[PDB]
């Protein structure tokens, strides 16, 4: 698995070379599908290795949801040094995997035939995607996971082909997805940055390191935050704000080149506050008008070597029309500190580069590549990416 484009140059992609994506080398100047919509689709599931079988995970079954939670908790994404692993909660998984239009057949699991143990997974959810001058119904792919005991046995390509087949059956022929590794071919490359909120604990568990010329006392002083936000009229999003949050987001996203196109029901799903999942705060000014909003989702991580999870908040969508973005994000940091998060994470996409350094974010070691499947278009800079996944 290559982490840079230079490593990716010196690699062959036996699977991705067979897929309708552009080659890593080529520079793209056209806009459109690689292959046609299919007017007949394979009715039979793809063949798994002997002793494994497909299943569709009904997450409304609490027992099945726990099986998926356990698979990811033990086998999903780790940092580059194998010190931390994502710990998506069951309630978070329901939020990410049952948005409007979700389908249980798009919760595609692999089980051991004899024991029924869940050992693999991949998911699709529907999304309307604006890419340059085109709006396309697509799916978002997430949670590709193969049990550590089943790795390097070609199961991931089978998972990808099977979810492709199941999405094709519903008449959808494009997808968007992200990955920490380089594959053919990123439409955009983003980088995570990190804002320490509880620096003591972050240095303790080695998420971050003391600047070595700086002491712990100076570090805690450097990163300290106010006790309450400063923006006038800031309050949690409520039901009555759903239309204006939808209207604010739609107009704000027009300036980027890769964005979601959300219905009002989708806006309610992705933004209405749910404790320990998603937080949204709106600014309601002295006229009663909602003019801005900030949002972040909750994604803790297991500390693998030694304890409490590393509690992280991830910047979601932040829309400003009256409050300066720098002020809005200062208040996001203070609210995250108030809620007990240890670190606040943000990518360098959209306008985030305008505040990351000023608000004392430090650059991370992980890139996040964005990809489209069966859509060949020019690549874009991180500041034109306007899409945030979970």
């Amino acid at each position: 698995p290559a982490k840079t484009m230079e490593e990716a140059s010196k690699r062959s992609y036996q699977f991705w070379d067979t897929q309708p994506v552009p080659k890593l080398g080529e520079v793209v100047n056209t806009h459109g599908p690689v292959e046609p919509d299919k007017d007949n689709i394979r009715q039979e599931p793809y063949t798994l290795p002997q002793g494994f079988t497909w299943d569709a995970l009904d997450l409304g079954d609490r027992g099945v949801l726990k099986e998926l939670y356990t698979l990811l908790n033990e086998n999903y994404v780790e940092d580059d040094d194998n010190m931390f692993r994502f710990d998506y909660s069951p309630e978070f998984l329901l939020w990410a995997l049952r948005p409007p239009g979700w389908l249980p057949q798009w919760h595609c699991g692999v089980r051991v035939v004899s024991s029924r143990k869940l050992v693999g997974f991949i998911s699709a959810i529907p999304a309307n995607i604006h890419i340059y001058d085109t709006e396309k119904k697509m799916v978002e792919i997430n949670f590709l996971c193969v049990h550590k005991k089943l790795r390097s046995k070609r199961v991931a390509p089978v998972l990808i082909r099977e979810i492709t087949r199941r999405v094709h059956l519903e008449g959808i022929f494009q997808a968007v997805y992200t990955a920490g590794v380089v594959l053919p071919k990123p439409v955009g490359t983003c980088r995570y940055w990190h804002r320490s909120l509880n620096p003591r604990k972050l240095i303790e568990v080695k998420f971050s390191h003391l600047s070595r010329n700086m002491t712990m006392q100076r570090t805690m002083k450097l990163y300290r935050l106010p006790e309450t936000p400063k923006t006038a009229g800031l309050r949690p999003m409520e039901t009555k704000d759903i239309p204006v949050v939808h209207q604010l987001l739609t107009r704000y996203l027009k300036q980027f080149h890769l964005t979601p196109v959300m219905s009002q029901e989708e806006v309610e799903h992705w933004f209405y506050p749910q404790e320990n999942i998603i937080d949204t705060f709106v600014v309601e000014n002295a006229n009663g008008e909602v003019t801005d909003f900030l949002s972040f989702y909750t994604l803790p991580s297991t500390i693998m070597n030694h304890h409490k999870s590393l509690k992280a908040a991830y910047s979601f969508y932040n829309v400003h029309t009256q409050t300066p973005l720098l002020d809005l994000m200062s208040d996001a940091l203070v609210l995250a500190k108030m809620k007990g998060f240890d670190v606040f994470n943000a990518l360098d996409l959209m306008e985030n580069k305008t505040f990351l350094e000023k608000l004392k974010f430090g650059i991370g070691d992980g890139n996040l590549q964005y990809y489209l499947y069966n859509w060949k278009c020019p690549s874009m800079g991180a500041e034109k990416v306007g899409l945030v996944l979970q």
Binding site: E78, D80, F86, N142, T178, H194, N345, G364
Partner: peptide
């Protein structure tokens, strides 16, 4: 899937 990143 998401990427796990930490302080460089």
């Amino acid at each position: 899937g998401n990427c796990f990143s930490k302080a460089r």
